[PDB]
Paper text:
Based on the overall more similar kinetics with Glc and Gal, we expected the V546C mutant to behave structurally more similar to H167A (and the wild type) than does the H450G variant. The differences between the wild-type mimic H167A and V546C when binding 3FGlc are very subtle. Upon replacement, the second branching methyl group in Val546 is eliminated, allowing the introduced cysteine to relax the 546 backbone, which in turn allows the Cβ atom of residue 546 to move slightly closer to the sugar. Thus, for the competing 2- and 3-oxidation binding modes of Glc, the V546C mutant is indeed structurally almost identical to TmP2O H167A and the wild type (unpublished results).
Numbering used by the authors:
A (entry chain A), B (entry chain A): 46 to 618
C (entry chain A): 92 to 181
D (entry chain A): 454 to 543
Write the structure that this text describes.
């Protein structure tokens, strides 16, 4: 018997943990995955010395914990088998594929991650605010009070994630790029560092934030927290919430302990679901919310008819560029060079303080030292120079989010022929209109690896503004990127597979009125009709957004938690 | 001040830990890597529910922690850059490549793993004994006493690893294959399960063994062990052992704490190095054993002239096959089938106990149930059937080790068009004659990611018996594999890149006499001349072997540890 | 039999490929899901580009091809001309 | 007729091709037929195959053939990477 139970240990779950453990509640949290981030439970897997010294390898850790949501049945022809080998007569259901899934109306890139800390054990840590145009309303008919509420919430989210905008300020590459783009767009667009949930520990090490940063996930009571109560149970699949006959309250949570194989029930006062945009919906549909099976509009759902409808996922465009000869030469423009590399007459100098210098002294010293210490290297950038982390945030005249950076998730055979110091990544994310016909649904016959109803998408990028925007977005990346360098062969401009970006929203969407706004939770993230059930995460977001959604989702959880502290009393100690 | 210090936390290091912590010694162990296997320190990363339910993804975790040893300078021509992009005039030293390395005399597949538990946090767990022909002598001129010593040591190694040969006995696929190969080679070759360091917990879960299984790596004293003393220090790069002027004793170990960045010295009575075949040699060469820089036979080394010479790595050949129509039909040969799948008249039956049945009742029940429950599936093998784990061990008439199995390390884009139940992997490993000219050496100018001397190989498979064997090995795989099925397109018979198999040996080799046997350690694994320095691991193995070397290496550590308990007194408590 | 092809014999593969027209190409079912949202996108794997909807892809001779030029296939062939022994011969 | 991206890294003087051709039992069920609805480029009835290598001797032979090429070829050299032993498309 707990005061609160939380399903999932990602950063939205940990947000509830932090708020409620902190306010004196007896909390239990379950995760279907296991502890595997070392002694800091749920921490970023990229915070090892070895991965910050071999950062290209980290793509392998990401790929290792992205399990695809719905893989259609495979119809590739293999006709060079030996005549003796067993050969198919048909393309029958093979290797865990989903026969419900139409391959042509899928989010084939969508994937889930099942480990303690969720996806925040691998993510890129970008945490921008949404402006009004991308954000759901929290106050009706009062634009300025809506702004102040969002500002209050986001400011708190940013402290929980340790969001900052200056961790890369001493990078030559970062500033090379930033300054050129500010110059080029002078006035018309503003560039800044990507706000990043991260703290720099040294010039070659960044402590990336995660679920652990929000809440350390250590069981309580303990010496550091002797009057808090928290227990995390890993390797427990949560399968169903039990409704009372009134559909006004949840009475238990049904679970499957994966180690013993036993099934149990858990009672609490408050039930919170933060299993992710896909798995929140799966658990609700298994519990008799929404509708199970292929959509059938001839059978109105009894509860939450909007559940699994109006889903959104962003369009993503990508390339890499190789830095221009112009930009590279500009790095060393305050240097006087005499002699020729490798003689002992060779001299690279600058005047410290010189009003005519284009760069600050610190920049010139790095360049001087690199050039003198490494006289066989043909580039003026130091080898340990941190990577760029540049953005122009979404605006009405350019309604996409942009990252001009170095992401650990490479999409191709990472290449070796071009010096890494020259390479810049470009990712532009578009916003997607919510439409009722775009759906995530669950099979009433096919089941997944955990014997739960198999997830199935029915999705196309909407015609009209979504599609026009996505193609204007592609053109913008082409135009903007040419300012910095030409494309890197094998990383040419392209749309990524649908759902690869993992920003899926609106699967359990938020609004003021269940009917009128076609929604599932209210602005306290409470499920309509039910006193003690709440949903957290990106699934709540009802709007068309291009920016990275997690900080937003956290803000909404903070507000949800105020509702809980004002409406439920913690058990005595 | 410790009684014993151990460099590295892989399973050979943990062998010393187990023996010496157990015998009452005050032990400290350092690793340059960090704890990241969840709450069981140094355990197999494949022991999560999620990875045993998505086993194809585990290749990504392996690739994520294999960092290449020596990558030659890249000379690929990229001539489709934009004219504006910075373009090279030469193939200069880029992206951490090693200019000392000849690309044509490399072990390009060789890689190291830096995490607590070492490579045993990802390995395949195959642990066969070497027969006489592959094994170094531990007793001179007495074949039968040599056998009994090896038998005593191996039996102890097998308990520490929990080696077994029946964990797969209930697999239809495993037995399908095993029985056909026994029949086909009747008499001339014997097949058995690959001995595996592993314990089955259920029909769909195997608890794979690791460094953790040898020694749990928990600091001591603790409640379970109140009179033992052990401390593990992760993220500490060990750089040098300090010799006394007599070169008869080590006086300290110099270390670099990677978190603070500070450098310290550690004193102990006994020094043990188990940093792996490559990193043991690197640490010794940094300490003035052997010779630093490109080999120069005009400057005889002062200590251990054989260090880094006579290295061996095995040749590896690979394919996959698709199971024959014949073999698949044989799975269901005791079944009477009436009706046609999917009608309600459909019936699949057998007689339990029938003397005329080719299979045991348990086999027939699985097949019956699968066929009746899954009437849309065209194969008689159940979906959760465990994978084959078959071997014919090395013999003089077939001097290669063989694995006929399913390995988590796939080498190609894992494919989806052919049902996984039909696929069998074939890996044949050859033995390599030790030659003085085959070397691992360290640069006196280039340094690696940890500012240590850059490793550089000079290696070719020896002409003569090694090469003839490797090509007869390839032919054997071709011949033997056809008995089970034809090759899977995209997995055709091939030699793998040199060193991919990660069985490198002889970099610090064992013998009776330093001069006479061209060696570095004696049969107690003690370094010649030095009272208190020992080396563990595959680097000790002086012979040409085809079988997986780790169990052997453990056996040698067990013997080393007897020497220590008989020659050094633990500090009082 | 040109001087230029006997001096650059690797290029002759291109002349062979240039006159082998496939006999029966089943309907294509490859998924292309990285089209721009603005581009025309199929709802089904309909009959495209001269493919044959009668053809089962799994019971084909997909490599079979014909050559339509004066001299037929003997304008590109390898010229191997062995006798059949009794066991192969009508 | 090379089947792959002709390669340049290994001297052509070292390279030898191996092609082993098997015999196929005639079976009534293996057919070439023509569509009464689909037509080809010359408005003639579209050719359509219904073919599998026969079970029994044909298939056993084809796999013993593959093994023979493997065994025989090793006498001359090892396989060239990117030209490894394979069945060609039917
Ligand atoms: C993978 C990835 C993800 C993101 C980025 C890049 C990469 C490669 N980058 C990124 C993202 N978001 C941003 O805003 N900024 C960035 O730069 N990524 C997305 C981000 O990582 C997610 O939006 C965020 O985690 C969502 O948090 P959450 O709502 O707490 O959900 P999680 O998926 O992280 O964790 C949920 C959780 O629940 C479990 N689970 C699932 N089913 C169950 C059941 N049935 N019972 C119990 N537990 C369950 C999981 O195992 C998991 O831990
Ligand atoms: C990666 C891999 C390895 C093996 C198999 C498959 C795969 C994909 N399969 C396998 C193997 N061996 C077998 O006999 N059977 C199998 O089926 N693999 C090899 C096996 O995994 C190794 O032979 C074994 O670990 C060797 O053990 P070890 O001698 O204890 O060495 P490790 O590499 O495991 O650990 C050494 C260790 O030392 C560290 N390190 C390195 N440098 C330093 C310095 N300078 N200071 C401190 N520590 C250092 C590492 O970080 C590491 O933990
Ligand atoms: O695909 C990688 C991208 O994935 C997204 O999930 C992130 O929000 C981006 F920051 C990131 O670059
Ligand atoms: O490359 C994978 C192989 O690596 C080797 O290190 C192992 O000993 C084999 F068992 C394994 O199949």
């Amino acid at each position: 018997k707990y005061d609160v139970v939380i399903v999932g240990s990602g950063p939205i779950g940990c947000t509830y943990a932090r708020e409620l453990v902190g306010a004196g509640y007896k909390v239990a949290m379950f995760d279907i995955g296991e502890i595997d981030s070392g002694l800091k439970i749920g921490a970023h897997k990229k915070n090892t010395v070895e991965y910050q010294k071999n950062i290209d390898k980290f793509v392998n850790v990401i790929q290792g914990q992205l399990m695809s949501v719905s893989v259609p049945v495979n119809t590739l022809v293999v006709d060079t088998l030996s005549p003796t080998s067993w050969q198919a007569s048909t393309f029958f259901v093979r290797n865990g594929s989903n026969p419900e899934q139409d391959p042509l109306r899928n989010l084939s890139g969508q994937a889930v991650t099942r480990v303690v800390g969720g996806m925040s054990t691998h993510w890129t840590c970008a945490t921008p605010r949404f402006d009004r145009e991308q954000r759901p309303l929290l106050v009706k008919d009062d634009a300025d009070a809506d702004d102040a509420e969002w500002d209050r919430l986001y400011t708190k989210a940013e402290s929980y994630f340790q969001t900052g905008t200056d961790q890369f300020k001493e990078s030559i590459r970062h500033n090379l790029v930033l300054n050129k783009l500010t110059e080029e767009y002078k006035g018309q667009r503003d560039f800044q560092q990507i706000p990043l949930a991260a703290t720099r520990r040294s010039p070659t090490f960044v402590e990336w934030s995660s679920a652990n940063t929000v809440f350390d996930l250590q069981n309580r009571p303990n010496t550091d927290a002797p009057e808090e109560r928290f227990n995390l149970f890993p390797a427990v699949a949560c399968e169903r919430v039990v409704r009372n006959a009134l559909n006004s309250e949840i009475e238990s949570l049904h679970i499957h302990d994966l180690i013993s194989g036993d099934r149990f029930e858990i009672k609490a006062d408050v039930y919170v679901l933060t299993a992710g945009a896909v798995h929140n919906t799966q658990l609700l549909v298994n519990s008799g919310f929404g509708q199970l099976g292929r959509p059938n509009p001839a059978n109105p759902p009894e509860l939450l008819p909007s559940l699994g409808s109006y889903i959104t996922e962003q369009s993503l465009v990508f390339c890499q560029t190789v830095m221009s000869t112009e930009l590279i030469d500009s790095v060393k423009s305050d240097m006087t060079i005499r002699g020729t590399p490798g003689e002992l007459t060779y001299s690279v100098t600058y005047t410290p303080g010189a009003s005519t210098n284009k760069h600050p002294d610190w920049w010139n010293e790095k360049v001087k030292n690199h050039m003198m210490q490494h006289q066989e290297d043909p580039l003026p950038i130091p080898f340990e120079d941190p990577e760029p982390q540049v953005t122009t945030l979404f605006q009405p005249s350019h309604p996409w989010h942009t990252q001009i950076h170095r992401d650990a998730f490479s999409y191709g055979a990472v290449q070796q022929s071009i010096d890494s110091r020259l390479i810049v990544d470009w990712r532009f994310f578009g916003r997607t209109e919510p439409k009722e016909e775009n759906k995530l649904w669950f099979s009433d016959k096919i089941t997944d690896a955990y014997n739960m109803p198999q997830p199935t998408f029915d999705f196309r990028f909407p015609a009209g503004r979504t599609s026009k925007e996505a193609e204007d977005m592609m053109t913008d990346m082409c135009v903007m990127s040419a300012k910095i360098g030409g494309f890197l062969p094998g990383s040419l401009p392209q749309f990524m597979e649908p759902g690869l970006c993992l920003h899926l929203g609106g699967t359990h969407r938020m609004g003021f009125d269940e009917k009128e706004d076609n929604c599932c939770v209210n602005t306290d993230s409470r499920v309509f009709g039910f006193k003690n059930l709440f949903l957290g995460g990106c699934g709540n977001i009802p709007t068309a957004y291009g920016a990275n959604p997690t900080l937003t989702a956290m803000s909404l959880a903070i507000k949800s938690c105020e509702y809980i502290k004002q409406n439920f009393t913690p058990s005595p100690f």
